[PDB]
Structure 1
Amino acid sequence: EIPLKYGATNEGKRQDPAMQKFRDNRLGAFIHWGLYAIPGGEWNGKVYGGAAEWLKSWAKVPADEWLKLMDQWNPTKFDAKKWAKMAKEMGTKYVKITTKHHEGFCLWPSKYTKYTVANTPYKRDILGELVKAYNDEGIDVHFYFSVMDWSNPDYRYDIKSKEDSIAFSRFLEFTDNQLKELATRYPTVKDFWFDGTWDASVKKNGWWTAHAEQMLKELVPGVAINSRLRADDKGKRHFDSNGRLMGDYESGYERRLPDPVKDLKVTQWDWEACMTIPENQWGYHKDWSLSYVKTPIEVIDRIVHAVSMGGNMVVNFGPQADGDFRPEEKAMATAIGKWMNRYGKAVYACDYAGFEKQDWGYYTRGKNDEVYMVVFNQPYSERLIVKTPKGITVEKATLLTTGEDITVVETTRNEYNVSVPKKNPGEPYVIQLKVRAAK
């Protein structure tokens, strides 16, 4: 039992209303928009296969030259109200937005650097416009923030001298200044999602991570803060040296998900996954032919997977330099929307059901103990196996969309066959169960 000044603060899950809202939302969208959208994965005639938002790094571009892209930042077609309508249509309950990515260009007019939307042809506070528009649609807004900043020469990868420590201290002050600015300018913010916190410099300054958390929580009542921010006294990240989760939720499942049989531990805390549509492109990349692009069902599978294990899912979009979305992303949002409008009662405000995973798909549990079977793999047996925990019986099954009764046959103590619907729904579908727990 190691003593710590900067380890975990919460005992278990938060149960205040703001955290309940963050959780119940379940489905979000991510927006990665920054200067990287202009070159779109291509530099000096070479198309790089790596993540477009990291092109400065793949193409070895100096800061001064990368940041000149500001001169071409003029997203003519940007319309925050349309963006918010797209998110509403998709069925997202929240949007996480890159306030500043590693490149250091700010989507709000920060008073602490010149690398902002203010000093571009477009001039306008993009972030402020998005906050307003999303909020006007009843959508919560979360702020991605990269600590690592390639634009600020006081940043250090590691502390190897008293000079390094001096510089980095001034960097942390700068960072605090931007964070306070974001929190006070945009007080409807519900979450800060930190990235670029893996460097030895940050690991060595655990105290600062804890301070940033407490500082923002004092400025924004009920605000959520991701685990990725946090390092403890010993430099251990996400979970402290006593194994306890720091921040309000776990945020390491990025383009991967916990195993539904082996990783049930994650049901013990709040957590949020994020994903990309191609294999690894967050910012806009001009050529999606270079890697596998997920289909809508593939994405819907991941979303349901997350909720079935007590987590949120956030699907990423990388808008074009002009401020519009590419057609693949429009088609995606629309397809997700269509399915969520039909089957969303099994996603929104749902959670882990505590049933043994079966091959047909995933269970989710509603606020009133509804148990939803979300079927992705249709058995040729025409029977969906349901193994119940001790003391739980299944009293009824109903096809969510039609209300039709579905036959349930008991096969053993604690197991049933739930019949597939008489007509094959032809898409991933939901059967709602009524269950009863014995006294």
Structure 2
Amino acid sequence: MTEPLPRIQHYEDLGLGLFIHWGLYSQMAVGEWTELIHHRNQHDYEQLIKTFTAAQFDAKKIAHAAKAVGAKYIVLTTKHHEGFFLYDTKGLSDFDVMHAPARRDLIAEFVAACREEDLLPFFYMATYDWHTPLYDDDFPAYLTYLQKSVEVLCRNYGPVGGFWFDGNWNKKDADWHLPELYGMIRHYQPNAIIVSNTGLKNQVSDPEIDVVTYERRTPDEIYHGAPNEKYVAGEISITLNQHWGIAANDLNYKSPAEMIETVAHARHIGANILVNIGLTGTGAIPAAAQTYMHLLGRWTAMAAPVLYKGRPVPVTSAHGTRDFVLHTSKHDFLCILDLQVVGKDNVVLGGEGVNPRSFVGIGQPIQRIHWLDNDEVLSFTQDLDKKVLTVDATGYPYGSDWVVRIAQIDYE
């Protein structure tokens, strides 16, 4: 049974990434699929190139914000279904940022900014393309165009963290020549992570795929490939409302609490997680996304000891709880949900009674257990023969609520 290749091991250590949707669609703020979904006249929609100034895009600020949220990589949409490229395609197309008023290779600014902050730059590429008539009219030539667009990314920006391929609504059954495309990527970017949102066709879609995406609600530890074959990692994605590109009248935002639980859940099932934000037309992080990033950032700073290196382990929680354990080489960590805030005396807020939370699968004697957020030592008992650990999971100090609270176990 295979173990991850070094570059995949590294990918798993990244833990959290920021996904950034930004394209011509951003100017209309009605979702990234607007051209197809709203049946827009193609010519009129493509005129959006003329007002693509990128006047507020600051890759340095974006990389800084990603670092502060505790992300270790960023996936930027280099070309979405609309087919507009955020980089210099060096003559491949006129529908690129060099032909917009911006006149800046935004991908170059992005990679430079990522490097300064020690973040891996990843490139999102949509394979279903609405711009080029090649897609319907001459699919083999389309493949060449797709491949060349990828090749430019592989050869003009230095080492790349990875590629994130999106083939939602792909041509069913057509030959995508993945071995040629992935093969080319390996030749120029041997170390790049290849991610696919259609990497599972029963069975990976190509040997060169490193990561497959999964739905955020996946209950159990994800699939890592057949037992004698290359280990493939997993990734889940969450966007803040219902849309990936900015959508001004989409008010259906998830709670910050659910965001935190999703990040925790991803780690529990052995996947990375991407948190998505949609930039404004001119390239700014919207205020709403800033709020979510600030809250997530406080959680990830507290969870830093386990968020990156923590792995799933055969330790289960007791009946009726959502609690789980993550393992690093030096420690185990209890991730504890559904805690309440502690009041005092007459003021009952919910958390003040003893709160025994049990786990099954810990066989080693424990010296100390403490909450990461405030270093409070927890009392506990063990039955080593049955591998039971029971901790008194105290509630939050008044004035705080971490949503997912983490206790570090220090072994005897």
TM-score by length of 1: 0.82
- Aligned residues: CA RMSD: 2.4
Partners of 1:15 and 1:313 in 2: how far apart? 20
Partners of 1:334 and 1:182 in 2: how far apart? 31
Partners of 1:82 and 1:332 in 2: how far apart? 16
| Contact 1:238-1:245 within 8 A present in 2 as well | no
Partners of 2:106 and 2:47 in 1: how far apart? 19
Partners of 1:13 and 1:66 in 2: how far apart? 47
Gaps of 5+ in 1: 1-10, 42-51, 157-163
Displacement of 1:393 in angstroms is 5.0
Q: Does 1:211 align with 2:180?
A: yes
Paired residues for 1:124-203 under 5 Å: 124-156=104-136, 167-196=138-167, 198-200=169-171, 203=173
| Contact 1:360-1:378 within 8 A present in 2 as well | no
Partners of 1:426 and 1:230 in 2: how far apart? 38
Q: Does 1:114 align with 2:94?
A: yes
Partner of 2:229: none
Gaps of 5+ in 2: 226-231, 341-350
Displacement of 1:196 in angstroms is 2.4
Q: What are the Cα deviations for residues 228-279 of structure 1, in whole angstroms up to 9, with x where unaligned?
A: 3558xxxx37635xxx9871122132xx2310xxx2353674101111001x
Partners of 2:270 and 2:207 in 1: how far apart? 15
Displacement of 1:375 in angstroms is 1.9
Partner of 2:41: 62
Q: Does 1:35 align with 2:10?
A: no
Candidates 273, 278, 281, aligned match of 2:236: 273
Partners of 2:190 and 2:303 in 1: how far apart? 33
Calculate percent identity across the aligned residue pairs.
24
Partner of 2:279: 319
Partners of 1:401 and 1:55 in 2: how far apart? 43
Q: 1:129 to 1:135 in 2, by over 3 A?
A: same
Candidates 357, 375, 381, aligned match of 1:385: 357
Paired residues for 1:290-439 under 5 Å: 291=252, 293-358=253-318, 359-366=321-328, 368-378=329-339, 382-389=354-361, 391-392=363-364, 394-410=366-382, 413-421=386-394, 424=397, 426-427=401-402, 428-435=404-411
Displacement of 1:335 in angstroms is 1.1
Partner of 1:161: none
| Contact 2:237-2:275 within 8 A present in 1 as well | yes
Q: 1:13 to 1:72 in 2, by over 3 A?
A: farther
| Contact 1:355-1:388 within 8 A present in 2 as well | yes
| Contact 1:154-1:168 within 8 A present in 2 as well | yes
| Contact 2:357-2:390 within 8 A present in 1 as well | yes
Q: What are the Cα deviations for residues 119-145 of structure 1, in whole angstroms up to 9, with x where unaligned?
A: 111111111111111211111111110
Letter in 1 for 2:274: V
Q: Does 1:15 align with 2:8?
A: no
Partner of 2:78: 99
Displacement of 1:151 in angstroms is 0.3
Letter in 2 for 1:426: D
Partners of 1:100 and 1:377 in 2: how far apart? 41
Letter in 2 for 1:33: W
Q: What are the Cα deviations for residues 77-133 of structure 1, in whole angstroms up to 9, with x where unaligned?
A: 221111111111111111001010000000001121111001111111111111111
Letter in 1 for 2:240: I
Q: Secondary structure of the residue that 1:177 maps to in structure 2?
A: helix
